[PDB]
């Protein structure tokens, strides 16, 4: 009788920086998508490996809700098989992703006169993330042949940078809140089913 807490994820007052992306486990609950079905303001609502029309009919052994903020031009990167700063260094979907990606323009909440700089991305990393990997380290990034030893300088850079969310920003630089619903199908009891 007890619905999965999608409201807690979609309507959270604070959203995570993409580099420190948030993950909520959803289990042992009825997954009623009817509140997403009656939404029209999402900029994107795509599922991979399942039809959005069948989400109320399906059972999964686990569900994860990952949430974070990115720029408009970067929403494309939240999909299987993408490269770029976000897919490579911040949040990586697997090539065979099963789940749904929902994004919406959050300019009303996430941009301020003078700019909101609270949302960060990783700009540098020694290698690409594996799918669903999270890197929250702040080690000075060694870009040259000489080690940094935690001192910034030439070829020694802080690995994170603020998005600058100004109201004057073009569509591609406006903030977008993202919710990724990842579905797992293992040889294990189903924890999450739809109403029917």
């Amino acid at each position, epitope marked *: 009788t007890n619905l999965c807490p999608f409201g807690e994820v979609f309507n959270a007052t604070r959203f995570a920086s993409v580099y420190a992306w948030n993950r909520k486990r959803i289990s042992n609950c009825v997954a009623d998508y009817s509140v997403l079905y009656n939404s029209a303001s999402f900029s994107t609502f795509k599922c991979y490996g399942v*039809s959005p029309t069948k989400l109320n009919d399906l059972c999964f052994t686990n569900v994860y809700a990952d949430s974070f903020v990115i720029r408009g031009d970067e929403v494309r990167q939240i999909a299987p098989g993408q490269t770029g700063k976000i897919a490579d260094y911040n949040y990586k979907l697997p090539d065979d992703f099963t789940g749904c990606v929902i994004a919406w323009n959050s300019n009303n909440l996430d941009s301020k006169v003078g700019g909101n700089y609270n949302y960060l991305y990783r700009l540098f990393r020694k290698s690409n993330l594996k799918p669903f990997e999270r890197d929250i380290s702040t080690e000075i990034y060694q870009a040259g042949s000489t080690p940094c030893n935690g001192v910034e300088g030439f070829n020694c850079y802080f690995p994170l940078q603020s998005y600058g969310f100004q109201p004057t920003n073009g569509v591609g630089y406006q903030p977008y809140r993202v919710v990724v619903l990842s579905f797992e199908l293992l040889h294990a009891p189903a924890t999450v089913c739809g109403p029917k």
Partner: nanobody
Amino acid sequence: QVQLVESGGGLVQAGGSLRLACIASGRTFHSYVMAWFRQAPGKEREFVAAISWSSTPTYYGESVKGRFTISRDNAKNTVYLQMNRLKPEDTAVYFCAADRGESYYYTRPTEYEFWGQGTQVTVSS
């Protein structure tokens, strides 16, 4: 680098039938939800039909439901649009579109990453 190429358009009499085809280059076709959009003389791209990876489900715009059939053949990297009982209103450039993802908002052009240049259909009387 994925290309969609539409063919099978030309002149046809009202009441008549036409089969559009769209071939995707490479071997990524199977991973795509395929759709058809159309642009009538001096109007916006309008949704016509879409087909999910497994051939089910299928979707149709209100004005072509019953008359048109979308189908796919993964072995030929081809999506097809069978158009029957054609009217002058069906005169348009028909564009093939493709995405990795199946959208809840399947009628939105912005939900499809890949686009052909389109094939011209003309229905006369």
